[PDB]
Amino acid sequence: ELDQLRQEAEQLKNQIRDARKACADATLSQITNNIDPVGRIQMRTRRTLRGHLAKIYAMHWGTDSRLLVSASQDGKLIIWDSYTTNKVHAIPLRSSWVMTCAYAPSGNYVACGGLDNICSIYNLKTREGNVRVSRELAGHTGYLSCCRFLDDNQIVTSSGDTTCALWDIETGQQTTTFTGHTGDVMSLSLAPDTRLFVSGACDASAKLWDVREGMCRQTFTGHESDINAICFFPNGNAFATGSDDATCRLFDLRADQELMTYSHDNIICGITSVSFSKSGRLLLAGYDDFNCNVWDALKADRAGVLAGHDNRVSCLGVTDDGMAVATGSWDSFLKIWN
Amino acid sequence: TEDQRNEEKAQREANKKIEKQLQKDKQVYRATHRLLLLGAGESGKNTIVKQMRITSGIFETKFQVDKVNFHMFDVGAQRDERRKWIQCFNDVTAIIFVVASSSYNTNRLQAALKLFDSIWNNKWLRDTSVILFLNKQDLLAEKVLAGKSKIEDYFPEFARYTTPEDATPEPGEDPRVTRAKYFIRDEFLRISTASGDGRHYCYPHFTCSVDTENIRRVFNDCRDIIQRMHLRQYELL
Amino acid sequence: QVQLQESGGGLVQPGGSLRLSCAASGFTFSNYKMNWVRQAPGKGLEWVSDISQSGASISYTGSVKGRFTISRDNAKNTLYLQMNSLKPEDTAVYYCARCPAPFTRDCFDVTSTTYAYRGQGTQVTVSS
Amino acid sequence: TASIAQARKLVEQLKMEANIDRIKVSKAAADLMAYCEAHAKEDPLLTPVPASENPFR
Amino acid sequence: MESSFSFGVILAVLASLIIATNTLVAVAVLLLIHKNDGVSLCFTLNLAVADTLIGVAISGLLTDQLSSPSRPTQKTLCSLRMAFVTSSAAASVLTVMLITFDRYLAIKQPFRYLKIMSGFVAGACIAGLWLVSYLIGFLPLGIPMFQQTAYKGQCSFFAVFHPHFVLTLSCVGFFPAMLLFVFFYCDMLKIASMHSQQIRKMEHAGAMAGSDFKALRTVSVLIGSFALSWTPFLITGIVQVACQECHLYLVLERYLWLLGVGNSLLNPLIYAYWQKEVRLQLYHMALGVKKV
Ligand SMILES: CCCCCCCC/C=C/CCCCCCCC(=O)OC[C@@H](O)COP(=O)(O)OCC[N+](C)(C)C
After folding, report:
1. Which residues, at least 6 apart from D25, have a Cβ–Cβ distance to it below 8 Å?
2. What CA–CA distance (Å, rounded) separates E143 from E145?
3. Which end of chain A has fewer beta carbons closer than 10 Å to its terminal beta carbon, N or C?
4. What is its main location (chain E)?
């Protein structure tokens, strides 16, 4: 029975490939040959943040584009005032090995997690004035890789147990568990409408999930190695992914296939993070080579390079208003570019 | 805008308080050494933790040696795919790799050798020294002293290996036991020495699960690692 | 999609020889290290032999050293494992596995849990 | 059980995936270009921004 | 006269090179300290500043090497600057000793060094160093015996300062420091040799399964730098003190002095350029300048 099941799966995968190929009437590269290229843009470090002791792994911009939170594996979670470089809070973490952080859309809560397999929610506006642990989520069986807030009461989490889950903060129980990924889930991105999200799970594939229906809608398998970064296109109809193969790929949720691949001859290192600008024309990706490249989403060329760091780039996030982009690195320093 | 200046002053006061707190945190942090405990589940690593102490994804054991703070992390409740979460420990002082020597018939010794090679040759772990604990020495001694488990059946190079002249055996061990012990030690070493970079070093140690010297051994390896790093910084080594 | 298709197997009398093959597609074959692993009935995964990108470096497990031969053909994205003088203990399902990253010799393809970059495997039986 | 259960789940998941509708790549490219050109001006990173409103100055 | 000009030119050249090299080293160490928390970098910056100060000081003496008049009244004026030179040199030597001490401490007490070392201690040390340097330099100003009588209307170190000053400055100052230096470095060399033999044993074992002079190469250099810097001048001053009729002023404060000055030039290489971090920072400066 197993052989017949595998044969049926292979035949239906071949049917999927044939259907996808039939829709490949033309390539995005050919269509975008006419548009004016961005040329060259040279960003400069406008602010430098210092105070973290160990390597910084993750950060998140606020919805107001003023406050941001960054997580360092020394056990400290710090909230920064982007405009004035001041520090608003310095939350001490129970577990030093924090691997993710998140900022609530309303900003009333901050979440983080790591190798402890527990996601802790911190309340920033307690009447006492001090930061306190509001809720602890301990249903996962692996390190927390990523987490993002849907609202003040709903948070989606990524774990190394190969399954994603939706958590009801007030109840503290998993409302829905997403399964189907083979490898460790690394990055999580919520769609602009908050109804869909995508993630790569170290199996060279990206899965599209429905937050309410609790099932996988589409699967993309254009990558060759583990996927470390994922981010939606600003319109929500496409998303870009970063993988260890040193190539970034853009997928469209309606075409159901890769549109183009971003790569170059002399880059042989994996991508750690990826993000889009407000217009979506600029794709910013962090690399293990201590610098971040800027790619033209349409013309498939490098528009600029950010080389303010001297260690591995761990995180990269653009402001909601698109005014500036902040990048973190293992050197324990954050550079804000504009 | 007097309110703006007032809130700016309040923010500066909060920043000063946070700076003082972070300075204290930095002072305490730099004085503490972090260690990673690794090895197969069948190994005696669990007994070592219990001796030194005398569902979470990681366990922390804190002990003081000569009034020196050491933090040890045991990665439990984690999947066997170590290639991702292992990168987090790229800044640890040393990695305590515990391998049971008496594990040759799955051939757990070969798996341990491959894992050690992977950690040593990893891109991000090249800056971390590895403390190699060769555990279960009594089991190996009783297995090789009289038994049918031939080492050459699983390691054919053993038949043409002789104990090095620069070896110090404990008074009373049979020459065959010492030969097997040093063969395993050199098999582990040949992976590390092959790098030739000198950025990190391996410190093999014949160990028993009940040995109380393990704490002293770890202290000595930490001292040696720090001294070698400082000497290489000063171009002495 | 990353696909690995092992071929060759069946039953062979002890002391014979067998040729295993591994078709590869969906990735740049030359940029990844490859190795062979096996799982005997009732036993866990075992590493057999590995080959570098260009093949200049080759290694075998002690119980297979000098007995089998691992070779790769980057021109047609195929990997081979020549086996001779087989013994009953060699009976096991042999999986053709590719460990994660290119341009790196660090390699973690012995994990017990389902590995995304290994093929279905082929059964090899050694009996009279 | 688990060995065949995984394949039985995978086949049904792929069958469910196959039932979705698909759009040609050309129209997706057209939509992407339309979005990029419509929102090009509102991107402070793509185009220069005077220091009068740039908060990071 | 042509003699003083021929020497003054050399002085000028030396001074300018010294100042430029030490300014580059100081800016490199400042940027690196901004980029990293290395406490030892503060010592290096101290050293560079000391060196630049020395260079500056030397420059001052140019006024009387070049064709210029002189008068008895010049005593105090020129004396001040000679004291300044003395101070600068003492500062440099104590910076070197401080560095040495730091190194020694780090090697011998790896845990306590990390536990106690901080910016406060380094700043305190620096301050004290400066203070003692200044003190040492300005001793002869107040002390009678150290003051040279019979002012000729011309100046140098010995025109103003009695050879008893170099006597003392040798006996209590430089010799002890040298001794300490030597001791520290010998202990360091012994530890490095032990580590080297251990590493060689492990490497030989690994090779079978499948550089010794480097510590001396650095130790020797270091020693032959620190000692050699001022040893010849002090020895010659000792001799002159001992002597009743010896006439070595023709070399003592004409050429044996300059071996000392040269140290200030050797330092910014030895102590800064020999470190990979400073080389990387300088390469970054070069790239940035090329990008302007
Ligand atoms: C704790 C550690 C302490 C270390 C202390 C180190 C001290 C090193 C000493 C520094 C001061 C001496 C070096 C300055 C010498 C300046 C000499 C000069 O700049 O004059 C040259 C020439 O112009 C002068 O005279 P002359 O006619 O050629 O030679 C006769 C000299 N007298 C007769 C005038 C006395």
Report:
1. A23, A24, A25, A26, A27, A28, A252, A255, A257, A259
2. 6
3. N
4. membrane
- Chain E interface, Cβ < 8 Å to B: 103, 106-107, 110-111, 114-115, 118, 188-189, 191-192, 195-196, 199, 201-203, 205-210, 214-215, 218-219, 274-275
φ, ψ of residue A106 to 5 degrees: the values are -80, -15
- In total, the C-beta contacts within 8 angstroms joining chain A to chain D are 153
H/E stretch holding E42 reads helix E40-60
Amino acid (1-letter code) at residue B109: L
E215–B186 C-beta distance less than 8 A? no
Question: Ligand 1: which atom is nearest the Cα of residue E4?
Answer: 23
Ligand 1 neighbours (beta carbon < 6 A): E 61, 85-86, 89-90, 93-94, 136, 154, 156-159, 169, 173-174, 177, 230, 249, 253-254, 257, 260
Which superfamily, per CATH, for A1-337?
YVTN repeat-like/Quinoprotein amine dehydrogenase (2.130.10.10)
Into how many domains does chain E fold? 1
Resolution in A: 3.1
- Order the strands of the B129-135 sheet from edge to edge: B59-65, B68-74, B32-38, B94-100, B129-135, B202-206
Residue among E157, E160, E171 whose CB has most ligand 1 atoms within 8 A, to mutate? E157
Q: Where are the alpha helices (DSSP H) in chain C?
A: none
Select C3-126's CATH number: 3.20.20.70, 3.40.50.720, 2.60.40.10, 3.40.718.10.
Answer: 2.60.40.10
Q: Whose CA is nearest to atom 25 of ligand 1?
A: E156
Q: How was this structure determined?
A: cryo-EM
> Hey, what long-range contacts does E189-193 have (CB within 8 A, 24 or more apart)?
E189/B236, E189/E215, E189/E216, E189/E219, E191/B227, E191/B231, E191/E107, E191/E108, E192/B231, E192/B236, E192/B237
Beta-carbon separation of C62 and B156 below 8 A: yes
Of A182, A221, A268, nearest to C103 by CB-CB distance is: A268
Which burial class, exposed, middle or buried, applies to A193 when counting CB atoms under 10 A from its CB (0-12, 13-18, 19+)?
A: exposed
Q: Note whether B69 and B222 are within 8 A (CB).
A: no
Chain C and chain A touch, per 3+ beta carbon pairs within 8 A = yes
Candidates C101, C103, C116; nearest CB to A182: C116
Sheet of A119-123: strand order equals A98-103, A109-114, A119-123, A132-137
Q: b/e string for A39-60 if b means 16 or more Cβ within 10 A?
A: eeeebebbbebebbbbbbbbbb
> Hey, of E118, E195, E213, which one would you mutate to test binding to chain B, going by the most B CBs within 10 A of its CB?
E195
The DSSP symbol for A316 reads: E
Nearest CA in chain C to B119: C106
Q: Which residues pair with C122 in a beta bridge?
A: C94
